[PDB]
Design a protein around this ligand. Structure first.
Ligand SMILES: CC(=O)Nc1cc(C(=O)O)ccc1F
Length: 171
């Protein structure tokens, strides 16, 4: 049975309970904390790619008003984000199960850009999601997993200094 678990969930929970923020820049900014995923129950010999994308958690624009995040009143459809292919992809089940799969090199941007970077809408709330795609084999197969604990608002600068302080303390 394919088990997918969040590494350092205790750290992510400190961020979530303050409302997490991730910087987006024109050229793209790496994530802290990094999404790290513990995977077991793959076929050690089968061949898989690991994909990361970001679900808009709601259809609203958020704003930091009097020290608190509040949703706008005017929801718009949020298009699904583009997918980031983990650079170790494609790779054997054994490669993925031997250490946490770490998405340390994904860069979050607010502008349609060359390559690699994932474009997110500023002041939208996002839920990281992975897809494990069985490749090359006869039967293609996808398993998807969400990480509620890793939800964040995409921001061009930090609003809640409590987040700034946690980022610096643990980076
Ligand atoms: C570099 C790499 O792994 N690419 C990729 C290929 C397929 C495919 O062949 O369907 C599915 C997912 C992927 F991420």
């Amino acid at each position: 049975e394919l088990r997918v678990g969040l590494e350092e969930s205790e750290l992510w929970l400190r961020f979530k309970e303050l409302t997490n923020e991730m910087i987006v820049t024109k050229n793209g900014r790496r994530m802290f904390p990094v999404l790290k995923v513990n995977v077991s129950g793959l076929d050690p010999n089968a061949m898989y790619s690991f994909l990361l994308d970001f679900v808009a958690a709601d259809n609203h624009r958020w704003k930091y008003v009097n020290g608190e995040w509040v949703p706008g009143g005017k929801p718009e459809p949020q298009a699904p984000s583009c997918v980031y292919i983990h650079p170790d992809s494609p790779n054997f089940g054994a490669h993925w199960m031997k250490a946490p799969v770490s998405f340390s090199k994904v860069k979050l941007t607010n502008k349609l850009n060359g390559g690699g970077q994932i474009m997110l809408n500023s002041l939208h709330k996002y839920e990281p999601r992975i897809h494990i795609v069985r490749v090359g084999g006869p039967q293609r197969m996808i398993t998807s997993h969400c990480f509620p604990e890793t939800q964040f608002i995409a921001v061009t600068a930090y609003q809640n200094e409590e987040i700034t302080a946690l980022k610096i303390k643990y980076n």
